[PDB]
Amino acid sequence: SFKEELDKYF
Amino acid sequence: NIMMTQSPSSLAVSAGEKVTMSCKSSQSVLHSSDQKNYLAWYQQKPGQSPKLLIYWASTRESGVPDRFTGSGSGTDFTLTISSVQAEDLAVYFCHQYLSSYTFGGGTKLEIKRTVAAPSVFIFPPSDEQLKSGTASVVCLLNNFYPREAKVQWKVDNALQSGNSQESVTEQDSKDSTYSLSSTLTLSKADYEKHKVYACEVTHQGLSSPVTKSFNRGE
Amino acid sequence: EVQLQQSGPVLVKPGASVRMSCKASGYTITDYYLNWVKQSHGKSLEWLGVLNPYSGGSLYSQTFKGKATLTVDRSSSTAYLELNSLTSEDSAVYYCARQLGRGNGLDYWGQGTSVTVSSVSTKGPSVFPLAPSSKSTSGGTAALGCLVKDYFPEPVTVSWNSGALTSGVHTFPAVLQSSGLYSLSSVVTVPSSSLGTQTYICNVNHKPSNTKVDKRVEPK
């Protein structure tokens, strides 16, 4: 979910 | 999404008092790779943009006074202001950034101070406005506390209804007072039918109503 | 000093699109991410998404996916937010806010861009003096002001003496008149002793109607 999308994006 | 809940909705303290406010997240905001709670606090003074105070739940941002301290872990966070100053009036928001960013609904910190009666002023319509067919008469109540105040408009001692609007300022960041402006709006034709235009003001700091008035065209 | 300078307030019709800007100065724009955050009614904050000025790539809240578009012009150090298919519910102040990296807070925010979505047309205010008189004195002080009447949408900005007069100013929240137009007043208290030597001018700006009015306020 979204926490991992933030991790990948940053 | 992670839901952020702040309490209380508002609170009011005198300068020098300690305050605490709560922020609860609906799930953990702990980021595993760095073992940091991805939780920030912001201060938003009236008319300004938010200012970052705290991040990682408890690390104070550079330049933030040390009276502001963030604490907590898991789902329960706290912002403490150790000794509130008059300029700390603001809405304080928490923010989680572990997942899709969400904010709490804010805690509004208001300041308590001694009673201050309003200074009252009245303004006739400008000649420029009159030439255009309308008369706006303005009554100003300056720098009073607490915020509750009542204005009544009287025209040759007749109480008016239905033809005025008012608004009150945010609290002042230096003296903790409020001010209020009321506008009575009439047509030019009605304005010219009467002599005495009066604003009558009631407030805790006054033992009897104060009236400020003018005589039209004088 | 770091600054994020956002474009001015705008009125747009339902169904239209709008693009607003956020210009970074005092730092290299590619050194920090840029977030966009909506504020409704001066309080509730809602995140739209984040852009990386170096790559130009963005990550959006699911709420704004396909509704918001983040872009950047690295040459002019300027980020952009475009919103499409606008509804009344999109009226808000939109902030841009820098974020150094994943773990950081939003450390510096622009001043916000107010977007009003409405079928009502823009209207610029009339500006009238609130002239000091014998009935606007309180113990050696005089109150004076400007009435900024009949405009749409918010906001109006008022300064005094081009920003050199700020002490004792109260610029009141606007009121919504029955007509659907706004009115506000801005007042200041000054010494009565110097009304003849000092000059007081309110500078009124209503960007949506191109109103820039300076009004000299003198004793009646």
d(CA B68, CA B61): 10
Asked if B55 contacts C105 with a C-beta cutoff of 8 angstroms, the reply is: yes
Q: Is C189 on the interface with B (CB under 8 A)?
A: yes
C76 and C181 part of one domain: no
Q: Which residues contact B163 (CB under 8 A, 6 or more apart)?
A: B153, B184, B185, B186
Asked if C100 contacts C107 with a C-beta cutoff of 8 angstroms, the reply is: yes
**Structure-token match 């898991």, residue found:** B74
C136 and C177 part of one domain: yes
Mutate to test the interface with C, among B1, B42, B44, B126 (most CBs of C within 10 A): B126
d(CA B15, CA B88): 9
Distance, C-alpha B115 to centroid of its chain = 17
> Residue B102: which of C47, C110, C184 has the nearest Cβ?
C47
d(CA B217, CA C1): 53
Residue ending a domain, among C117, C136, C160, is C117
Measured in angstroms, the resolution is: 1.4
Asked if B103 contacts B93 with a C-beta cutoff of 8 angstroms, the reply is: yes
Residues facing C158 on adjacent strands: C204
Tell me the CATH class for B4-112: mainly beta
Q: Is C189 helix (H, G, I), strand (E, B) or coil?
A: strand
- C-beta atoms surrounding C191 within 10 Å: 11
User: Amino acid identity, residue C216?
Assistant: R
Supply C34's token pair: 């840029």
Is B140 close to C220, i.e. CB distance below 8 A?
A: no
Name the H helices within B64-201.
127-131, 188-191
Asked if B53 contacts B43 with a C-beta cutoff of 8 angstroms, the reply is: yes
C69 and C95 part of one domain: yes
- The burial of C41, by beta-carbon neighbours within 10 Å (0-12 exposed, 13-18 middle, 19 or more buried), is given as exposed
Q: Is C163 helix (H, G, I), strand (E, B) or coil?
A: helix
Residues facing B153 on adjacent strands: B199
First to last CA, chain B: 65
C76 and C148 part of one domain: no
Q: Which residues contact B112 (CB under 8 A, 6 or more apart)?
A: B12, B13, B14, B176
Q: Is B32 on the interface with A (CB under 8 A)?
A: no
Is B101 close to C35, i.e. CB distance below 8 A?
A: yes
Is C111 close to B36, i.e. CB distance below 8 A?
A: no
C68 and C9 part of one domain: yes
Tell me the CATH class for B119-215: mainly beta
* Nearest residue in chain C measured CA to CA from A5: C59
d(CA B34, CA A3): 14
Q: What angle do CA C110, C115, C119 make, to 5 degrees?
A: 175
* Nearest residue in chain C measured CA to CA from B39: C105
Q: Is C202 helix (H, G, I), strand (E, B) or coil?
A: strand
Total of domains in chain C = 2
First to last CA, chain C: 44
Asked if B105 contacts B8 with a C-beta cutoff of 8 angstroms, the reply is: no
**Structure-token match 């903790």, residue found:** B176
d(CA C111, CA C155): 13
Residues facing B135 on adjacent strands: B186
How many Å lie between the alpha carbon of B98 and the closest alpha carbon of chain A?
A: 6
State which residues form the domain around C206: 126-217
**What are the chain A neighbours of C102 within 8 Å (beta carbons)?**
6-7, 10
Asked if B117 contacts B104 with a C-beta cutoff of 8 angstroms, the reply is: no
Is A6 close to B99, i.e. CB distance below 8 A?
A: yes
How many Å lie between the alpha carbon of B49 and the closest alpha carbon of chain A?
A: 25
First to last CA, chain A: 15
- C-beta atoms surrounding C67 within 10 Å: 17
Residue ending a domain, among C96, C117, C138, is C117
- The burial of B100, by beta-carbon neighbours within 10 Å (0-12 exposed, 13-18 middle, 19 or more buried), is given as buried
**What are the chain B neighbours of C44 within 8 Å (beta carbons)?**
103, 105-106
